[PDB]
Design a binder for this molecule. Structure first.
Ligand SMILES: *[C@@H]1O[C@H](CO)[C@@H](O)[C@H](O)[C@H]1NC(C)=O
Lengths: 49, 48
């Protein structure tokens, strides 16, 4: 009914779109790098050129 | 104006003729082609 956009359906066969399955989980995978690069040195340096 | 040609013998010939009748039936889906598995794209597709 949602595919044909109507409440009354005639007798026959019809192809239907996807309205059944929906995701419910989140999977995040990042590399395990722990070192913190300095934004206190490239930004707050001694003297910019 | 006074000569004719009348055949004295014959032959039986079998010839082949090929004719197409039908082709493949194709069904498409607007979902999982235009947007795929993406709810944000599917939300904007409801107006079409
Ligand atoms: C930069 O560092 C100096 C000392 O390390 C500090 O006095 C200054 O406030 C810093 N600049 C900023 C914008 O935080």
């Amino acid at each position: 009914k949602c595919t044909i956009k109507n409440f009354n359906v005639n007798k026959g066969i019809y192809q239907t779109s996807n309205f059944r399955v929906s995701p419910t989980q989140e999977v995040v995978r990042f590399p395990n790098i722990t070192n913190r690069c300095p934004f206190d040195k490239v930004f707050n340096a001694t003297r910019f050129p | 104006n006074n000569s004719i040609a009348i055949p004295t013998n014959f032959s039986i010939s079998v010839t082949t003729e090929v004719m197409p009748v039908s082709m493949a039936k194709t069904s498409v889906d607007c979902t999982m082609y235009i947007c795929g598995d993406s709810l944000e794209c599917s939300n904007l597709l409801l107006q079409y």
